[PDB]
DNA sequence: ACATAATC
DNA sequence: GATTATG
DNA sequence: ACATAATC
DNA sequence: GATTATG
């Protein structure tokens, strides 16, 4: 019933993240394969941060 | 707005997939890191489809 | 503890 | 995304 | 079309 | 996992 160990972002993934989600809340998977290149990220985790992301931003 | 395109799996990956949900209908991170491996799929398409097929399941 | 990563 | 669970 | 892969 | 969407 192991889940994968919660993923530390380094202060630069989180620009790139960062960056990506103030052009767009539901990035394509044409951009999220990219961000994940630039990122050393796998796609899913960029999925998953996106989703994470926009919890945050309506928590507001 | 475009989604990743489905995948299809070949018939030795479903063996390995349906072998390891005969075993558990919810395999541990380490499991599907494995399974993936083995299949050379992604442990995120593992996940998907394991959750995809618990759906088969219930809905018989 | 809680902010937030992972599950489903 | 609501819920669960951890670095 | 629908069985079932992907999203969220 | 409920919902959405496609090979």
Redesign the interface.
């Known amino acids: 019933?192991?889940?994968?160990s919660r993923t530390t972002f380094t202060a630069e993934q989180l620009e790139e993240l960062e960056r990506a989600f103030e052009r767009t809340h539901?990035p394509?998977?044409?951009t999220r394969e990219e961000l994940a290149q630039r990122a050393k990220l796998?796609?899913?985790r960029v999925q998953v941060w996106f989703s994470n992301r926009r919890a945050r931003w309506r928590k507001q």
Do not use: F, L, M, V
């Not at 019933?1 to 994968?4: I, K, M, W």
């Open positions: 019933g192991q889940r994968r539901y394509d998977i044409y796998t796609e899913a």
